[PDB]
Amino acid sequence: NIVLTQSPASLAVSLGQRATISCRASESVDSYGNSFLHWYQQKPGQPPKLLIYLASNLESGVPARFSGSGSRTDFTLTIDPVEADDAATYYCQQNNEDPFTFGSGTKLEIKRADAAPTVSIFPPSSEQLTSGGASVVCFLNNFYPKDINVKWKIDGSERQNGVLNSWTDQDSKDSTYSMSSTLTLTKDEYERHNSYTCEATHKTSTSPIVKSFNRNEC
Amino acid sequence: NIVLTQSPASLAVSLGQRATISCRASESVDSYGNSFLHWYQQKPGQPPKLLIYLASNLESGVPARFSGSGSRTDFTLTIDPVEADDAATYYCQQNNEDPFTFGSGTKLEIKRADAAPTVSIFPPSSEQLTSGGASVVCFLNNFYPKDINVKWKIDGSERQNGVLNSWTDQDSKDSTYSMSSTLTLTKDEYERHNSYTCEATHKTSTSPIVKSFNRNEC
Amino acid sequence: QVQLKQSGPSLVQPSQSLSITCTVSGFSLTSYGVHWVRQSPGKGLEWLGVMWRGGNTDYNAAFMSRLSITKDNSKSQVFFKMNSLQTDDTAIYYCAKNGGAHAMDFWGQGTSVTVSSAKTTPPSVYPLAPGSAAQTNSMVTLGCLVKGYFPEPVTVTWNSGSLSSGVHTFPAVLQSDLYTLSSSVTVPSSTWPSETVTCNVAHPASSTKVDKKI
Amino acid sequence: QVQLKQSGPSLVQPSQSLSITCTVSGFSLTSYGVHWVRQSPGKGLEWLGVMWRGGNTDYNAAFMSRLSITKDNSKSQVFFKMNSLQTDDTAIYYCAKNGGAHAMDFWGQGTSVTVSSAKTTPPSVYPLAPGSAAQTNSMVTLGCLVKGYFPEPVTVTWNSGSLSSGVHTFPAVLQSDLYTLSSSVTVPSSTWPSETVTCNVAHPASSTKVDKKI
Amino acid sequence: VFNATRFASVYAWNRKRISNCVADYSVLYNSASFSTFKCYGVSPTKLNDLCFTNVYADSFVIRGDEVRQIAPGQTGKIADYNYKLPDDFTGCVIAWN
């Protein structure tokens, strides 16, 4: 058995720099005539692909920016320069002994400049109001870093019952993040107060992100 | 006050399978880096003991078959391999907010092979009959499943006043069911007829398991 | 080495007070707090209180004014003071050591605290011998009838606990300030009426021990 | 040119079995051994097994007794039979072509196999339509709220996938035996409310197509 | 150090600094008295003859399901909060029931 304790668990490397994804192994020797392994990539918005075979060779379909080498246990995956195609999880696989397990997985994050999110609020549809429900969504997309917290504040009192968030990972190409905050309530809650407030606090926006929506938006 | 809606309320898992028991929660969240809870196992004749703490760490002193995981709200208990000594209930404890309440409680039973009950009846002592009462005990032990209709039927007609059963559920050591039926009658009713009948109908046995006794057996 | 047993309560009358003594051993009482719980009345397991590691004590909204916990660090004994006990306040208490993440690592034996206006009724033990028509299949059932006792707990066995695997236990029926307990013991068919079958009973509340031969 | 996508399972309970059908294209089954893996269920990527070229097959140490590979050389399809699955095994299962040094050169799209005791439920789609008071600045965002479906996946597109400029797919929020999926797409203002817009939602687990006009 | 009286805890692990001596590792690897013998950065058969400036012997006790957690970059409650092994750890770890 080979325990590929790949490290680190995640990286924050900006564009144009050198990212280092190490991969620790225990066994074995003489893969083909040496102690090399294969590297792979698993993107969140695209199927996976093979980057480096035998840890020293290039593969068609991917750029030549991926390189590296490795000893019996100390392996290295060098991505130099980092462009906007690297936001994904990287793995290392030994094939000289069953099971052909992979590494722990290094989630490389493209450390671009800080960017504020978009602003878009969607009142409920006619079918929702007809059925008595009212689900409002306050989207905050195209931002960096992923650290974002939405506070659904109704003018009467802050509501935190039906608050759900969808934290989308960094797309392979689009280096920005995307998060959607929902609030599923009844029609009486939507018709409770004239105005409402979608509050949020992001690292980029020093001022509190505030966008209101009225009950008459139908 | 968090009412941990522990589901399922009961399970009949056979030998060699994997039992899965959930535990719902709603508060709190992100105490330090998670909001995991604990698990316990209460026997029918002994208070419970700690199996898993923080839903991801094993505790010594108990069998190693118990494990589990959990999200911030849903916590899972994994019992693998299910053996013939895991005939007991389970619980999950609230720890993030006081009071340290528990869940509903899942009653796990081992699906053993079918078996017929014993055939024997026990009349009372001479002192009980002399005082005016009568306590005849009719045992139906070491049977499976628990689906058995026990009802006293005196020679005159079906009895509905002195009917009383004491059901013993599946024990850890004894994986079979046991039920002791009692008969509450007076001296005259005990000596009203010559023979009486302790009638019972088991699920697998189409014919009723009966055992009669005479008033002179004392 | 580890001991969390309880003693003291036998039977309580309505509108009275009483304290339970749970002896602590096997661990530093100053480093770990003792929990208190009930035996699942109605819904799942109910929790009463716990003394912190030299801090404060937690209670429920309904039991903060009536029940109290006292942790004696010198004698290694945690006391559970009960106040204003009424007939509907029946409960079976247990002690348990506090763990790291507020866990319950060790557990005790507990005690059954019954509250009722009725007086202590000792058990009317009688032997359950099989009738003449009862047959054998290389095994014979023998039991002891512990009927007409109040309150819980009670222990019935064979030869003062000589056999523990063949002795079966049944639940006691709850009557009007009374109980009816049935029991049975599996033995070989050739061991009765040949061998002496002495059944022992123990009622800790009334301190009654009636021996009856089957 | 190459296709290694999976299909067949909709929803499975824990401690049960299933059957997956992976359609192989681009290479003959006799030329390369189809591999079989998962998609990061918690910890790192997990390897399951591989069927060699007309010979035996290797399996994972933790899945040799439970999981099995059934390779059909006549239909150009590799079938997989799994047994005794747990909720933690929920992940996308992939098929891949063998490389030179036992590598996985090509990778497919796979299928998101979900293990959970809950039952299947179709999606109750409700569109996120801006009201009449909604404003626009040279563009308008649109989306749908697909709540009340189980299990994953669910594909939300804009007019059968006509739009691809600002399409953003969000993860499904695990509810009580249900899921909640949101979406957000960026389209110029000349398409809505001018042209006909309709949310197209597909649930491959139930093969349901829900159309809701935005 | 291995045959010491009592080891320290997992969080107060005792770092025994050793220097200026001869260390035979092939006799220990071929002793057949260790439950686990897994090295990182160099094989146990090759590190027997190597010169170093300083070596350490960290004494602690952990459960059978926990010995697999002591590795470079391996997660775990003891691996992150009690004993953090270096990610570039070029030494060796041993254990015995």
UniProtKB/Swiss-Prot annotation, chain E:
In the UniProt record, which residues carry a glycan? N3
Q: What is the effect of changing D65N?
A: In strain: Omicron/BA.2, Omicron/BA.2.12.1, Omicron/BA.2.75, Omicron/BA.4, Omicron/BA.5, Omicron/BQ.1.1, Omicron/XBB.1.5, Omicron/EG.5.1; complete loss of interaction with host integrins
Tell me the impact of changing S33P.
In strain: Omicron/BA.1, Omicron/BA.2, Omicron/BA.2.12.1, Omicron/BA.2.75, Omicron/BA.4, Omicron/BA.5, Omicron/BQ.1.1, Omicron/XBB.1.5, Omicron/EG.5.1
Outcome of R6K? Answer: In strain: Mu/B.1.621
Q: Which cysteine pairs are joined by S-S bonds?
A: C39-C92
The effect annotated for R6T is: In strain: Omicron/BQ.1.1, Omicron/XBB.1.5, Omicron/EG.5.1
Per the record, which residues fall in region Integrin-binding motif? 63-65
What's the subunit arrangement here?
A: Binds to host ACE2. RBD also interacts with the N-linked glycan on 'Asn-90' of ACE2. Cleavage of S generates a polybasic C-terminal sequence on S1 that binds to host Neuropilin-1 (NRP1) and Neuropilin-2 (NRP2) receptors. Interacts with host integrin alpha-5/beta-1 (ITGA5:ITGB1) and with ACE2 in complex with integrin alpha-5/beta-1 (ITGA5:ITGB1). May interact via cytoplasmic c-terminus with M protein. May interact (via N-terminus) with host bilirubin and biliverdin, thereby preventing antibody binding to the SARS-CoV-2 spike NTD via an allosteric mechanism.
Quote the function comment for this protein. Answer: Attaches the virion to the cell membrane by interacting with host receptor, initiating the infection. The major receptor is host ACE2. When S2/S2' has been cleaved, binding to the receptor triggers direct fusion at the cell membrane. When S2/S2' has not been cleaved, binding to the receptor results in internalization of the virus by endocytosis using host TFRC and GRM2 and leading to fusion of the virion membrane with the host endosomal membrane. Alternatively, may use NRP1/NRP2 and integrin as entry receptors.
- Supply the name of the protein: Spike protein S1
Organism per entry: Severe acute respiratory syndrome coronavirus 2
Q: What is the lineage of its organism?
A: Viruses, Riboviria, Orthornavirae, Pisuviricota, Pisoniviricetes
First and last residues shown, out of full length: 341 to 437 of 1273
